[PDB]
Amino acid sequence: QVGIPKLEVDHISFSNVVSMMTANIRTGDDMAVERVNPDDVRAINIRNA
Amino acid sequence: YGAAVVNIDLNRDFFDTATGIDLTKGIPLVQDLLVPIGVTAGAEQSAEY
């Protein structure tokens, strides 16, 4: 028989399997982009809907 | 003898600086006549032609 989910019944349980990152995930460099705004404002095609 | 190239250029002595024209680069070029608007600072130059 398959194990009853712990939240399904009213007993407390103090040994449980927590998933974890192996190390801090904010450690890396932040993303950065190269925005390059349009050559001529009058030439911009805002149409097409 | 020894002339390397002979070109037919617009005449500087007639199309003088008094008329605004600058023939030094092989084309006429007048400064603030038909300037484009809405563009980056170096982008006026072709209109000078």
From Swiss-Prot, chain B:
It comes from Bombyx mori cytoplasmic polyhedrosis virus (BmCPV). Belongs to the turreted BTV-fold inner capsid family. It is found in: Virion. Homodecamer; each decamer is made up of two conformers of VP2, called VP2A and VP2B. 12 homodecamers assemble to form an icosahedral capsid. This is Inner capsid protein VP1. Inner capsid protein that self-assembles to form an icosahedral capsid with a T=2 symmetry, which consists of 120 copies of VP2, with channels at each of its five-fold vertices. This capsid constitutes the innermost concentric layer of the viral mature particle.
